[PDB]
RNA sequence: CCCUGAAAAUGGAUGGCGCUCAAGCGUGUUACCUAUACUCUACCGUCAGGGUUGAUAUGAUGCCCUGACGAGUAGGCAGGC
RNA sequence: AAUAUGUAAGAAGUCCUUGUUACUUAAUUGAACGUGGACAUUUGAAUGAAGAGCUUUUAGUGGGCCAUUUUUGGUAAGCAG
RNA sequence: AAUACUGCCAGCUGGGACUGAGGACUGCGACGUAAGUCAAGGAUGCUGGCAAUGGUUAUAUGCCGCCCGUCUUGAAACA
RNA sequence: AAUUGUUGAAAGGGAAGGGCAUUUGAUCA
């Protein structure tokens, strides 16, 4: 009789997506990436500022 | 008054190509035409018997009749808000074969060959053609290909 | 607004419910609507759709035509169903036993069937015996055999029965039909 | 007549099993998304580090919205719009990128704005204005049952599966897109951002390809 | 009192309101304009093969 | 808009006849990446026989100022199409960043020569590291030692449409 | 950019008032107002897809469910006073 | 050149064997129609389709204009074409 | 390291306006081990005032609004 | 009914008449 909008009604959101509860529990919307570090090559570094 | 004849405004249409006048090469008369074959129509100026009209120049049609030296072509002409069939008899000279149909038979033969070979094992035949899909990822290496800086040139007044 | 690709609020173009005011016909239409709505056999839907056909769309079916249809292989033990009127043909002499269900039966055709050994039942009885139309065969008469359709689509080089009142000589047989007086059609 | 409880229990058991399969598939899809995004990021990183440049693959999906009315339209672009299912202003559809589709978009570019969509905006669109086409009717999608009933032959049975088929073009992307009614969006909440819409994006307007900038406009209009 | 002579405006729209229809094709096309000898021999061959089929399969 | 420097490196589509096509890099001042790519392609199909359909972009990046907090003198060579013909100019700006300098130059040209962004072409932007090669007086006057200039006739902004005291423009 | 070139008849037109680091001119960025335009909702009509003789219970041309649309001269059809 | 435009992108198809003819060929040599037999995921490029096809009847219409682009006559025209 | 810019959150929350359609249950979901409950296929509870709201017409105010019918590509015309 | 006279009510800076919403006056379940 009436359309309820997901992302605003938690009951409808959970009904549509059963994975929403697990997503909220694990806080997958804010996940820290691996702290890896790589250095660009001197060729690219010089080409960036080569005028 | 006004003039609309059988050969009106065909000065540059019913004209032989440059350095291609004279007789016709003896290859058209050796072509075999059968009922159902798709052929194109291109008028030749040397022969004035059985010449097609201006509208039927460049049109593509099926062969429905075979005669001594002529074939019948069915051409769909758009008059008003409908297409009407036209059965016109033309000489062999002003008619050539169409390579699109031949490419279709070649594709059909390759299609059947792949349907046999691939389905002998039964995995992902994919007999249908696909359009130009977007290019996948690629990596370019600047080993001897260092990008050269380019700048717009100043305006010049060369004569 | 919408750039409509088709006509808006256009009718389906099909006749729903009979245009006639025959009370018995409306009752039969209601019965067959109930059948076709609460069953799954396409025979009920076909019969219901044919019940809405007009007089020109419901040509009579002859007993000779019924016999010809039943002469087919495996059609001897089948119930003939005619949505319309069944007429009597005097050009046939041997009528096999059958079971024909139709709206109206000509007296001569009914007498012929009774004498042969068959019976004349109505659509309601046919539905009662076979709710799903089992072992039935639908017969329709010739629709293009009317004299009013010959004149349709008249044009040059067509020969489509020009609309005339009198027939014979000097009645649309002059120039326009002969090559000796100009052109032929 | 006491079997109503038995059918109720059987229905609950079947629904729970279906929900379990849906949850497993959703978890798999989320893991695949995270893995793909991280893989692209690290591939770019290694290409930068190894003295090279990473040429990203061209986007295979675009979103096209109509920014022009239904008046003063040439017949060929009008026909192309009808074939692309853009008959109302502020109506949007998803398009798989091929040569034919690119040449189709190049013809009705003056009347549409199209760009590469993202997963977040695709999910928001499907959740908010997601409507299906069942019996030539616009039935809203508020349950996975309707989606499974109308798309189970192609392996799609949930709204998350439909979103996955939209974002990643697969074998049944054509049917997945055809099942969805074109999205009827409203005018942008924050405005179009330009004084004249009927100018190219490089020229300062909404007309033309916007690439990744289409996400902001789509979310503002949705 | 001169008047406009000829114009093709709106003719395309008029013809496209009722979509331009390709001719309806059938498996057996019309056999008119065909060589009379070929038609006669085709009739004879058709009678022969019909008789052969009737004699073989009943 | 707020111009940003984008460097774009592109190349022709690889072919079996000529593998590993040459890479061409250009720096463009543009509002966004789409405008930067469009300008890159437009400039490329003016000096080289290439096109978007017969080419691709292998890299696009944004150049940030190394020292955006230092005041610099920039010399810019430009070529523009006027109402009657094409002319070449060299303008000296004083700004802390290349993007700000080119934005100021664009406003200057659009206000003084009625040249639009479709007309102004950035030929070259450079920084004059020695304060002796400057040949423009409006720039030289701001490089003098001990620069002190007042601000006469200060105009204040009032939050009310009526004032009960006669304003003073002292400073 | 501005000025001379540049002169027509009732008294008058960037609409006028008026405006001069403009409220004039080119360009760059935000906020603001609105169409019978767009999204949602309530009602009416039309069309399409359907359910409803397991009833006392009548109008299955009746009732109900879902979706879409609603401009208009000449003109056609349909329902009504 | 661009634009505009015709045809083909399959089951009315392809392939294997062989029945008919008063056509034709030196000739079971070719042509047409065939019988039997083999190939349904992916039926043979993308997209779309309040479904498509067909028949009857008839109201009004047969003075047009304007806008972008191409362009004729004319110096030009709110001129004609 | 921090910060600017862009994009994400199935992160939370403050304030304001419009709407209350449907009418015993039927379905999809959540909380609750379990009873039962819920913001879950369309709003209820409590309380206050009166027994004035509102309908018709005249004037007034802010805005809009050319004379009916025909001929005409063009009507309100000084047709 | 056109037209006209009185009584009672309202308006009237070179027209009257109408539509969108409301105040005021009269009247109304």
Q: What is the 3-state secondary structure (H, E, C) of F33-94?
A: HHHHHHHHHHHHHHHCCCCCCCEEEEEEEEECCCCCCCCEEEEEEEEEECCCCEEEEEEEEE
Q: What letters, b where the CB count within 10 A reaches 16 and e where it falls short, cover C36-65?
A: beeeebebbbbbbebbbbeeeebbbbbbbb
Structure tokens belonging to residue D94: 């998803």
Residues 6+ apart with CB under 8 A from B85: B74, B75, B76, B77, E23
Strands F23-30 and B148-149 come out as: parallel
CA-based nearest distance A13→chain D, Å: 9
Residue D209 in contact with partner chain F when CB distance is under 8 A: yes
Smallest CA–C1' separation from D163: which nucleotide?
Answer: I10
Alpha-carbon span D72 to D89, nearest angstrom: 13
Residues 6+ apart with CB under 8 A from F32: D213, F1, F4
State the residue for tokens 């969006």.
Answer: D185
H-type alpha helices, A1-51: 10-16, 19-26, 42-49
List the single residue in D57, D99, D100 with the smallest CB-CB distance to B136.
Answer: D57
Contact status, residue F42 vs residue F58, Cβ threshold 8 Å: no
Alpha-carbon span C35 to B82, nearest angstrom: 44
Alpha-carbon span F169 to E49, nearest angstrom: 117
Task: List F57's β-bridge partners, or say none.
Answer: F10
Smallest CA–C1' separation from E47: which nucleotide?
Answer: H20
List the single residue in E15, E23, E34 with the smallest CB-CB distance to B84.
Answer: E23
Alpha-carbon span C82 to C19, nearest angstrom: 20
Centroid of chain to Cα D143: 18
Distance F161 CA to G15 C1' (A): 28
Sheet of F4-12, strands arranged across = B148-149, F23-30, F4-12, F55-63
Alpha-carbon span D104 to D62, nearest angstrom: 13
Q: Residue F133 carries which DSSP code?
A: S
CA-CA-CA-CA dihedral for C122, C125, C129, C133, to nearest 10: 50
Query: Would you call F63 and A47 a contact, using CB atoms and an 8 Å cutoff?
Result: no
Give yes or no for CB of D87 within 7 Å of strand I: no
Task: List C102's β-bridge partners, or say none.
Answer: C82
Radius of gyration of chain E (CA): 25
Centroid of chain to Cα B33: 17
The experimental technique used to determine this model is cryo-EM
Smallest CA–C1' separation from A7: which nucleotide?
Answer: I10
Alpha-carbon span D191 to C15, nearest angstrom: 51
Q: Which residues of chain D does B146 touch, with a Cβ-Cβ cutoff of 8 Å?
A: none
Q: Closest residue of A to B151, CA-based?
A: A51
Handedness of CA B101, B106, B112, B114 (dihedral sign): negative
List the single residue in A3, A43, A44 with the smallest CB-CB distance to D140.
Answer: A3
Angle separating helix axes D119-129 and D159-167, nearest 10 degrees:
140
Query: Which of A6, F3, F92 has its CA nearest to residue D129?
Result: A6
Q: Backbone breaks in chain D (C–N > 2.5 Å) follow which residues?
A: none
10 Å Cβ neighbour count for A6? 22
Alpha-carbon span F32 to F3, nearest angstrom: 8
Angle formed at CA D217 by CA D216 and CA D220, multiple of 5 degrees: 85
Alpha-carbon span B92 to B25, nearest angstrom: 12
CA-based nearest distance F88→chain B, Å: 7
CB burial class (10 A; 0-12, 13-18, 19+) of residue F10? buried
Helix (H) or strand (E) holding D218: helix D214-221
Q: Which residues of chain D does B131 touch, with a Cβ-Cβ cutoff of 8 Å?
A: 98-100
Query: Which of C12, C49, C55, C15 has its CA nearest to residue C33?
Result: C49
Helix (H) or strand (E) holding D62: strand D61-66
Smallest CA–C1' separation from C16: which nucleotide?
Answer: G61
Query: Would you call F58 and B140 a contact, using CB atoms and an 8 Å cutoff?
Result: yes
Backbone angles phi, psi at C98, to 5 degrees: -155, -175
Angle separating helix axes D159-167 and D4-49, nearest 10 degrees:
30
Q: Put residue C38 in one of left, alpha, beta given phi > 0 → left and psi -120 to 50 → alpha.
A: alpha
In angstroms, what CA-CA distances link F158 with A19, F134, F162? Answer: 58, 42, 9
Query: Would you call B142 and A50 a contact, using CB atoms and an 8 Å cutoff?
Result: no
Q: Closest residue of D to A42, CA-based?
A: D51
**Sheet strands (E) in C10-139:** 61-62, 79-87, 99-105, 119-121, 136-139
Alpha-carbon span B38 to C31, nearest angstrom: 57
Helix (H) or strand (E) holding F102: helix F98-112
Distance F117 CA to H19 C1' (A): 82
Strands C136-139 and C79-87 come out as: parallel
Helix (H) or strand (E) holding C115: helix C107-116
Backbone angles phi, psi at B143, to 5 degrees: -95, 100
Contact status, residue F95 vs residue F101, Cβ threshold 8 Å: yes
Chain G: positions less than 7 Å from a protein CB are 1, 21, 25-32, 37-42, 45-53, 60-61, 66-71
Q: Tell me the resolution in Å.
A: 3.2
Residue F22 in contact with partner chain B when CB distance is under 8 A: yes
């Amino acid at each position: 009789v009436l359309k309820k909008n997901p992302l605003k009604n938690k009951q409808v959101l959970l009904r549509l997506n059963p994975y929403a509860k697990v997503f909220a529990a694990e806080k997958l919307g804010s996940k820290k990436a691996e702290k890896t570090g790589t250095k660009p090559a001197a060729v690219f570094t010089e080409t960036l500022k080569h005028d | 008054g006004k003039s609309h004849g059988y050969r009106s405004r065909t000065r540059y249409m019913f004209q032989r190509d440059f350095r291609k006048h004279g007789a016709v090469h003896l290859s058209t008369y050796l072509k075999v035409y059968k009922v159902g074959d798709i052929v194109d129509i291109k008028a030749n100026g040397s022969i004035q018997k059985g010449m097609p009209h201006k509208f039927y120049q460049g049109k593509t049609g099926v062969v429905y009749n075979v005669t001594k030296s002529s074939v019948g072509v069915i051409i769909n002409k758009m008059v008003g808000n409908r297409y009407l069939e036209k059965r016109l008899n033309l000489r062999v000279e002003h008619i050539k074969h169409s390579k699109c149909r031949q490419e279709f038979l070649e594709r059909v033969k390759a299609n059947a060959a792949k349907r046999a070979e691939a389905k002998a094992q039964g995995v992902a035949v994919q007999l249908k053609r696909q359009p130009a899909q977007p290019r996948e990822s690629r990596i370019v290496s600047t080993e001897g290909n260092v990008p050269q800086t380019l700048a717009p040139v100043p305006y010049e007044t060369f004569i | 607004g919408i750039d409509h690709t088709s006509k808006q609020h256009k009718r389906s173009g099909h006749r729903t419910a009979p245009k006639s005011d025959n009370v018995y016909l409306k009752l039969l239409v209601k019965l067959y609507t109930f059948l076709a709505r609460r069953t799954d056999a396409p025979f009920n839907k076909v019969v219901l759709k044919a019940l809405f056909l007009s007089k020109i769309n419901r040509p009579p079916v002859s007993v000779s035509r019924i016999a010809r249809a039943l002469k087919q292989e495996g059609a001897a033990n089948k119930t003939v169903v005619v949505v319309g009127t069944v007429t009597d043909d005097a050009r046939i002499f041997e009528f096999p036993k059958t079971t024909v269900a139709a709206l109206r039966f000509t007296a001569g055709a009914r007498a012929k069937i009774v004498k042969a050994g068959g019976e004349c039942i109505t659509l309601d009885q046919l539905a009662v015996r076979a709710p799903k139309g089992q072992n039935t065969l639908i017969l329709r008469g010739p629709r293009n055999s009317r004299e009013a359709v010959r004149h349709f689509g008249m044009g040059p080089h067509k020969g489509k029965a020009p609309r005339i009142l009198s027939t014979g000589r000097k009645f649309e047989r002059a120039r326009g039909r002969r090559r000796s007086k100009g052109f032929k059609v | 007549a006491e079997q109503v409880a038995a059918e109720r229990a059987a229905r609950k058991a079947a629904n729970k099993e279906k929900r379990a399969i849906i949850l497993e598939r959703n978890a798999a899809y989320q893991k695949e998304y995270e893995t793909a995004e991280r893989n692209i990021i690290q591939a770019k990183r290694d290409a930068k580090a190894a003295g090279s440049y990473y040429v990203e693959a061209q986007h295979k999906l675009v979103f096209v919205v109509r920014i022009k009315g239904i008046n003063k339209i040439p017949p060929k672009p009008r026909k192309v719009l009808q074939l692309l299912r853009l008959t109302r202003i502020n109506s949007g559809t998803f398009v798989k990128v091929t040569k034919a589709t690119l040449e189709l978009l190049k013809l009705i570019e003056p009347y549409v704005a199209y760009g590469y969509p993202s997963y977040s905006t695709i999910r928001q669109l499907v959740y908010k204005r997601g409507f299906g086409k069942i019996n030539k009717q616009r039935v809203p999608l508020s349950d996975n049952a309707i989606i499974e009933a109308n798309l189970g032959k192609y392996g799609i049975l949930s709204i998350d599966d439909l979103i996955h088929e939209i974002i990643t073009v697969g074998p049944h992307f054509k049917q997945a897109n055809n099942f969805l009614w074109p999205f009827k969006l409203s005018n942008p909440s924050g405005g179009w951002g330009v004084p004249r819409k009927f100018k190219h994006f490089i020229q300062g307007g909404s007309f033309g390809n916007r690439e990744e900038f289409i996400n902001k406009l789509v979310k503002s209009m949705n | 009192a001169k008047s406009k002579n000829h114009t093709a405006h709106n003719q395309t729209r008029k013809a496209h309101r009722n979509g331009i229809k390709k001719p309806k094709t059938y498996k057996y096309p019309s056999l008119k304009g065909v060589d009379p000898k070929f038609r006669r021999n085709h009739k004879h061959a058709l009678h022969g093969t019909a008789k052969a089929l009737a004699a073989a399969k009943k | 808009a707020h111009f940003k420097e984008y460097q774009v490196i592109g190349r022709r589509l690889p072919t079996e006849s000529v593998p590993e096509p040459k890479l061409f890099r250009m720096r463009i001042f543009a509002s966004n990446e789409v405008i930067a790519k469009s300008r890159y392609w437009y400039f490329l199909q003016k000096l080289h026989k290439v096109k978007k359909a017969s080419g691709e972009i292998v890299s696009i990046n944004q150049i940030n100022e190394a020292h955006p907090t230092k005041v610099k003198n920039f010399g810019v060579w430009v070529r523009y199409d006027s109402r009657s013909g094409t002319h070449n100019m060299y303008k000296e700006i004083r700004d802390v960043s290349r993007v700000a300098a080119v934005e100021t130059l664009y406003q200057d040209m659009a206000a003084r020569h009625r040249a639009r962004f479709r007309s102004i072409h950035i030929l070259k932007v450079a920084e004059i590291e020695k304060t002796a090669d400057v040949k423009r007086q409006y720039v030289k006057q701001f490089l003098t030692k001990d620069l002190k200039f007042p601000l006469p006739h200060r105009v204040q902004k009032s939050t009310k449409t009526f004032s009960y005291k006669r304003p003073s423009t002292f400073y």
